């Protein structure tokens, strides 16, 4: 699950890196580090939960929460997980990649029709 997400990160930065538009090519160096920086936080949080159950299986983690939900012992990690999740999808308030007031559509200011939808 963490490996698959990091392939998507590579997909995001490639959009602008093949473009000469200043707005589109602006959102690569800032896009790259934002996803790079909050990937360590998201990866470590997943590993702490995996450490509490000593399993890297999704099904085992869910079943391990029968008597207690990990929001009660690890509430701070849930805030940290949710904050990190916002950055990885580039959602606001971590919106600086595709900021309309700052960089218009970001990488999508050069995208239209099917490349925009996908």
């Amino acid at each position: 699950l963490l490996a698959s997400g990091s392939i998507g990160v590579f997909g995001t930065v490639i959009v602008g890196w093949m473009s000469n538009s200043k707005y589109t090519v602006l959102a690569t160096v800032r896009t790259t580090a934002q996803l790079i920086s909050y990937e360590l936080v998201l990866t470590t949080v997943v590993f702490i939960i995996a450490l509490i159950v000593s399993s890297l299986n999704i099904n085992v983690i869910i079943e391990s929460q029968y008597n207690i939900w990990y929001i009660i012992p690890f509430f701070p990690l849930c805030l940290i997980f949710f904050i990190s999740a916002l950055a990885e999808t580039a959602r606001p308030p971590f919106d600086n990649v595709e900021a309309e007031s700052e960089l218009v559509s970001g990488h999508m200011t050069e995208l239209s029709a099917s490349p925009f939808v996908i």
Partner: protein, 119 residues
């Protein structure tokens, strides 16, 4: 100039360059191939490097931008991200209201003022 541009240490006098098989001038016509024979260091502060005057990254924060709540052409000259110089190009909404008021009576000139600050 317009298109390109070009010490902390003692000026050291080196005279009499010689190797084991002869002196410099005896092999100076071949030393263009021997790169360990280059007398021109590339770290000397006086090293002439003809570098072009590449203009600073100049973004056009042009009118078609949500930030430009009118018609603004903001020209930003920056080093990296920190802004060095900014050149606002106003006038994209110049309609010559001041020229038009002079041809209308005081009662007709009033509506020209609701259209200065729209809000």
């Amino acid at each position: 100039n317009d298109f390109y541009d070009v010490n902390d240490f003692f000026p050291v006098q080196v005279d009499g360059i010689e190797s084991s098989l002869g002196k410099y001038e005896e092999f100076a016509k071949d030393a263009h191939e021997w790169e360990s024979w280059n007398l021109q260091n590339e770290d000397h502060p006086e090293y002439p490097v003809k570098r072009t005057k590449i203009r600073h990254f100049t973004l056009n924060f042009g009118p078609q931008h949500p930030a430009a709540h009118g018609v603004l052409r903001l020209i930003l000259e920056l080093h990296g991200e920190e802004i060095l110089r900014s050149d606002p190009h106003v006038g994209l909404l110049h309609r010559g209201t001041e020229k038009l008021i002079e041809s209308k009576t005081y009662m007709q000139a009033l509506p020209y003022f609701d259209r200065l600050d729209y809000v």
